[PDB]
Design a protein around this ligand. Structure first.
Ligand code: GLU
Ligand code: GLU
Ligand code: GLU
Lengths: 516, 516, 516
């Protein structure tokens, strides 16, 4: 190696005066720039369009936080042509050179941490620590993939030798692909999904989520200053499915990297399986599609520790995480003790404008608000509402931490991803039943168990079927490198982010033999 | 390691009297066994059916090599139930135990080599050496995957540590899947596609190609004797698309491993991308779909060496290989010298009943013969026929080595996979044009270059876009371990067989963290 | 690895106000619990007995610090049955699972550091830093052995392969054994001797030293909360040799791990060599039996540095360490300079109630006091008393730092382990004579040399025959992992604690071959 061993970027807690001062300064600079317009980024240059998109502050929706250009099919085609033109030479860059470019981008992002965090606060309603964790994770993806990519450098394949011949196998990138990013981790996942494929020689066209187009543009300002060659990375904010559908079904799109709802993920995977007219390859599609994550607590657990972890997991970033604890499975002996503690802690959570660093900011949009409130109405017919369950005062999309108890395992609110601050509590007889209920959903992303019994923990290690399992701690916040992130079943294709294996997904192998 | 380092099984040449004596006895016993009936193999037992399938000797179509039971939807469902039941416990076997089971199977197959080779000679028309190479490769897949699987044993993932926590990532098998095997390497590929997934904990339902059901049954006799637990491997010969379609589209089939025509591969990949009613995962589909492989020869090459390699590559097993040289691209200076040599060598090739160990046996079936002859008629109006181009006398499906020259690069015979003894010769101006023509097809499986110019070879290493490239030697016969086999573009998904990476395709990763 | 690399637990120096406050709080909690009764721990549960044992405060012997149950032969037999029953399943736990259990125990012990330290202060008279070092070392043993155990996981043996066979050699634990722990490091050594064997699959019956039964019980509270399966670890405090003799001579005790006096160690080793009626194995007995450790100082040394190290080594924990410097060998040129400095430093050492953090607390018991005073009387007839040599005022067993000079190398006080604050100074002609005198004792545990002459240091590295040798620093305080601890000659069997080799002592090897 030529750089220090990988270490995760520390997550700012803002416990010091300097940290709080720096954040206030960043928040001021960001809001003073709410009037800024961000164009598309195609072929190494910012390209504007006639029509525009408006980004709103979910904590005060009448306030615009910025506007961006709006890509259509014409711009998507232009981006694809630029991406393929760039691929022709970018694929030949020595890996050491590509990795150094990523390291430069990480250094630039680290120097703009507060600015990006403040943008997350105002654009998507993350409180201070959620915002800091998001940006820190983006930096981690860049630092991690830059190093991981070197493990695949020419010629990396272990082969069996043969007399009188040189047999060399090596990896090569696929080509130009499309990245469809989420609004809940618009810096972290947006960055990771792009730089992973790019690190090993691919080129990318990235479509940010509508609710997070401004922060996505700021990430591209970093890519631009870093110096990625024209066409290697492209930015196409857009409205509706136009751009995404056009690229996903395009005969010249080589791969698709997607993180979002199961509904969209299913359509993408189906489309990727089809041979578009003139297509000359089998498309690769990687999808991360959510979950219905549960935390199991049995009677041997430290009930206070469990309650704290459950509240953090269920309500962090208003429960808008694919990893959020949306189900709390309690064995009979743990039911009353844990539920009472969870309710006591949850009722003390503050909800308000994200910039004030409340425990919960607003949900991301009017549409998300409508969806969450709709599920709350559904829940009233399936379980017992014991906490919250309503919209709070203010134009901002503030929803109170919600808890439903005595929820049937097969109830809609115990099966479908609400993606809001709504926790469903399920009572079970014993640990075996807890595991059965935990596994009985179409998903398999995150899960947790609070217990002191070794046999129960190791039992879960073998049978709680989720891609990311945690014992006696929160089930959210997977760290790059430490906890490869990705699930089973309808949670996706198990493309483990923040792991060496992730980069292999964007490479193909060639074997060349020379008989002397 | 607890066994000797992997070494490829020697391919018998039958030059010694001992080898000839052994082969003659094996051929005699297999012939004397003609007419035998082989049932299906489901849940550890041989299960017969009312209806049956007939396997004919392509060298003498009136002769029935044997008959097998015929599986329908009911048998497929029974096999799927057995495979999932078995998966529950097979996935928990220590890897060392599963690997030892594979090694036992390899030892048993090795002891039945001559018998399996003789069965290939009679059932699919392979001459002696082609049959020996097939069986040797099957043994190699078992020996190689047995060892490779241990590289993924619990807990194999390299992760970054975190203070006060144990973070453990490991691989687990996917579940029960279906294997759809080809008739051209009915022992080798049939075995490889089954044992790879099985080695790491998956269970399989295998559908042999209709023309090679008998040898597939013999491979299962070996699996049974080795002791694979009931349900781990299942044998379902069948007629038509019924069985394959039912399993490929089944909501409970976890993965599909396919090797065959592009037409079928495209349908499988599309079906795999769809969520069948009640399906709870994104199906994985691995497909190897053929090629239109070329050998380029420039004016600096050893023309005699090139001509020999071209003839072996084009006519070995009657050109019925996805790796076969079906295109010969000659630069202006190499055209006359190489073509004259290729014609002289090809016109001396013997064609006759496979048991006689001719240079070429018959094509595999009446339908295949019809298709190859149809392509020859098409070729007569596209290029210039200069050798062969007709069916030979006899009941067997004998076709003479055929050569067309001055073939336009975009002609149907220069673009579509004929899978017969038909070589298309294309004349180009220089090496640059040779590479352009070589790359201009929808495929990308194998390719070769005969040249003494270092700059041309290294240029091809970087730009001749095929998964398996060979310099100054034949382009067929990839050896397990030595030459990871798999292509680009419409040649498939690049699932490299005989390589460490192959097994990763049948595993998913779990990350478990415990905060102490 | 799945956890951070091993690091030694920091030893608290109590230089901060918070540290001192935390210690005072811990001391208060511990003394408020002096009335507590601690039962035996057998088969996963606390089991009380009719008779009890009383633990006294050596700094105020009329004060009881706690009482415990008293095990007899019946309880020892019950513990052995529980240990064997547990072994049957504990031996089959994946090593990763056993190691995680140890890591949990370490985390629990770390959270109770101050409590354990305060218990050591009151029960065995350790001052603050000696107490902190003791607990920190116990944590180190758990953390170290948890990691070291993974190095022996299935199948760990490097063997030579053979054609057509799988040859696998692996380690397995021995069974149920007995641990006989010392009173001088009742948390550290008590813990290490137990968790080392347990980590790799053995089960243990532990007999704490009579003077330290309370702190031993607190360590078992940690084992209990950690969740070791019933029978894996058992606690049997007792009076006299009854329990120890019964287990050591038992036909069903598989191994014996002992740390204590040579007198007892010799008896244990002799008994272990005998085949008890019905015994079906050769018992393994590991014994650490003390020393008569010397520090050599020559004329080239930094005399002030040497004096400081000698005083720390001779009087730390009142010289009650098997590693304590009980002999000071000075060459002629170093004699006066070093002796004067040692006397000046030693005369400034404070002696008093351990809780007040004096340089020296009291010796551990009335019996130890009697022994040390007896050796002082013996010393008066062999050497010249120049410092201390008497009991101080108070009911506590306070003995003043003592120094005898002009001591003959073969004098009883220069040969026998006093285990008290008594240093014997021997004058020698040169370095060669210093080494001769250093080696001329029945022991060989620790030793030290203060010198700037490279040739003398390297000479000692090769010829100062002790298991743990230190240059220009104290000879006590061996750190887990850094300095494998164990001696030569009558200091024991050289079972190096805190080293990878330690765990091998509790394993046996099996070699299994399968001919395919
Ligand atoms: N990796 C994030 C979840 C990302 C997502 O919500 O998609 C976590 O572990 O909290
Ligand atoms: N691996 C074989 C080709 C297998 C196939 O035809 O599918 C070869 O290299 O000749
Ligand atoms: N390991 C301790 C000595 C333990 C004992 O006295 O038995 C030290 O080096 O000081």
């Amino acid at each position: 190696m030529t750089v220090e061993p990988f270490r995760n970027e520390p997550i700012e807690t803002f416990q010091t005066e300097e940290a709080r001062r720096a954040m206030r300064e960043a928040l001021r600079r960001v809001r003073e720039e709410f009037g800024r317009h961000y164009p598309l980024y195609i072929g190494g240059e910012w390209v504007d369009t006639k029509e525009r998109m408006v980004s709103l502050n979910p904590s005060a929706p009448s306030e615009v936080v910025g506007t961006t250009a709006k890509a259509g099919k014409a711009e998507a085609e232009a981006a694809l042509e630029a991406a393929w033109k760039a691929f022709k030479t970018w694929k030949d860059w020595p890996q050491e050179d590509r990795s150094r470019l990523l390291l430069k981008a990480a250094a630039l992002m680290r120097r703009r941490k507060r600015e990006l965090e403040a943008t997350l606060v105002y654009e998507v309603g993350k409180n201070w620590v959620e915002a800091s964790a998001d940006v820190a994770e983006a930096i981690d993806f860049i630092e991690y993939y830059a190093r991981a990519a070197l493990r695949y450098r020419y010629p990396a394949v272990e082969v069996v030798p043969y007399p009188g011949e040189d047999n060399e196998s090596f990896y090569v990138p696929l080509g130009a692909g499309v990245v469809i990013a989420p609004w809940n981790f618009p810096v972290a996942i947006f960055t990771g999904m792009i730089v992973g494929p790019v690190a090993v020689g691919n080129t990318v066209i990235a479509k940010p989520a509508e609710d997070a187009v401004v922060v996505g543009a700021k990430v591209f300002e970093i890519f631009h200053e870093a110096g990625f060659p024209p066409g290697v990375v492209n930015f196409l904010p857009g409205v509706g499915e136009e751009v995404g559908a056009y690229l996903v079904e395009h005969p010249r799109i080589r791969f698709i990297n997607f993180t979002g709802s199961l509904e969209v993920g299913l359509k993408i995977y189906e489309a990727a399986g089809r041979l578009a007219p003139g297509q000359t390859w089998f498309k690769r599609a990687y999808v991360e599609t959510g979950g219905k994550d549960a935390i199991i607590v049995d009677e041997t657990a430290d009930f206070d520790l469990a309650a704290e972890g459950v509240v953090v997991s269920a309500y962090g970033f208003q429960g808008q995480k694919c990893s959020a604890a949306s189900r709390l499975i309690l064995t009979q002996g743990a039911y009353e003790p844990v539920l009472e503690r969870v309710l006591k802690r949850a009722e003390r959570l503050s909800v308000g404008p994200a910039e004030e660093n409340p425990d919960l900011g607003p949900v991301v949009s009017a549409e998300q608000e409508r969806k969450v409130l709709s599920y709350i109405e559904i829940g009233k017919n399936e379980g017992q509402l014991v906490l919250g369950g309503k919209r709070l005062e203010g134009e901002g999309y503030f929803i109170a931490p919600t808890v439903f108890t005595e929820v049937p395992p097969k109830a809609r609110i115990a099966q479908e991803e609400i993606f809001g601050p709504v926790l469903s509590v399920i009572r079970v007889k014993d640990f075996a039943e807890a595991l059965e209920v935990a596994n009985d959903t179409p998903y398999g992303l995150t899960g947790g168990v609070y217990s002191r019994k070794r046999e129960h923990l190791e039992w879960a290690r073998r049978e709680f079927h989720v891609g990311n399992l945690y014992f006696n701690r929160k089930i959210t916040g997977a760290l790059v490198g430490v906890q490869p992130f990705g699930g089973f079943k309808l949670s996706g294709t198990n493309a483990k982010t923040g792991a060496l294996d992730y980069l292999r997904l964007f490479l193909e192998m060639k074997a060349v033999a020379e008989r002397f």
